[PDB]
């Protein structure tokens, strides 16, 4: 069975970019309602698997998509904030970024425009492309995770569901988006990469 | 006021990789068919736009789409074809070809996966990002355009509806794949690589 991973810091550890409030619902509900729903939901496949029952199959995909993509992405995006974060990345990262971007700054330009750019629920993505060899920007509806439904390797999300920062910053998402840049993870991110590599 | 292009050879010029009936069905009824209902969809579109209409404008998108995404991919797709053509391109796209994946049969192998891999019917796609400045394949369901939904700039489609193939290879998709590249216009792609840049 799947678990609720702890987070690696204290839920008033990223403020004030994050604030408190914010941390222990995103963590304590919506993070532990996905993994329960995942478990219900992958018990119920283990179900109708051995049956042959393929129409509950495919009637279960949506919630197994929604669960577990909501499981995968949560416990990515604790690893990639820190109180310790913000910055700069060094080594081959920063110099992956240079070389595929142009500059840290322009990088920074291209995550958010995706970030900023999806209409409803979603994601923001950093990813890496194990058949070209490069880093890739990408951006996902909802729940949907990035390695499942792109092939690329998840290396920085960005959470841009309204839960993720209304009650701090409300409509305005692009000020979430410059707070969140100052709690980023860089040595989990390198980490990541260098797992590619 | 959209209208039917001619086709730069004769139906019977690209035997026997691809036989005259199919030719002359696929751009005599098939294409003409996206430009009759694509003028008819874009004359609705317009009056619901003069009206504000916007409930109405919004019930146009999925025939605008179809029927324009049709008229775009037939377009590009009569040009990247030729009775003279085959073999391999020469200069800068060759050399793009190899930077961007490796050599020229990985490319193939490439584009004729993202082909073959094609659920129902649409396109697969050898296009430009421009952001980066490199060739990347892609592949698009039913009739939605590359440019339009992607970004990326056409360089060389290949259709895999059904009707681009069955009649001659039935259910055997790959043997169309295997022979369409007897025909491929590498002057034509060439010449969209070189106004890319
Ligand atoms: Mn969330
Ligand atoms: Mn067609």
Not at 85 to 111: N, T, V
Request: charged residues 20%; contains cysteine; proline residues 5%.
């Amino acid at each position: 069975k799947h678990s609720l991973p702890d987070l690696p810091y204290d839920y008033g550890a990223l403020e004030p970019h994050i604030n408190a409030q914010i941390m222990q619902l995103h963590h304590s509900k919506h993070h532990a309602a996905y993994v329960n729903n995942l478990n219900v939901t992958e018990e119920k496949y283990q179900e109708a698997l051995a049956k042959g029952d393929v129409t509950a199959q495919i009637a279960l995909q949506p919630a197994l998509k929604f669960n577990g993509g909501g499981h995968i992405n949560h416990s990515i995006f604790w690893t990639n904030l820190s109180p310790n974060g913000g910055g700069e990345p060094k080594g081959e990262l920063l110099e992956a970024i240079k070389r595929d971007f142009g500059s840290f700054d322009k990088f920074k330009e291209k995550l958010t425009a995706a970030s900023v750019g999806v209409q409803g629920s979603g994601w923001g993505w950093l990813g890496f492309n194990k058949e070209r060899g490069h880093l890739q920007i990408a951006a996902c509806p909802n729940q949907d995770p990035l390695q499942g439904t792109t092939g690329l390797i998840p290396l920085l999300g960005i959470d841009v569901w309204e839960h993720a920062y209304y009650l701090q910053y409300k409509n305005v998402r692009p000020d979430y988006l410059k707070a969140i840049w100052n709690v980023i993870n860089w040595e989990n991110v390198t980490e990541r990469y260098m797992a590619c590599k």
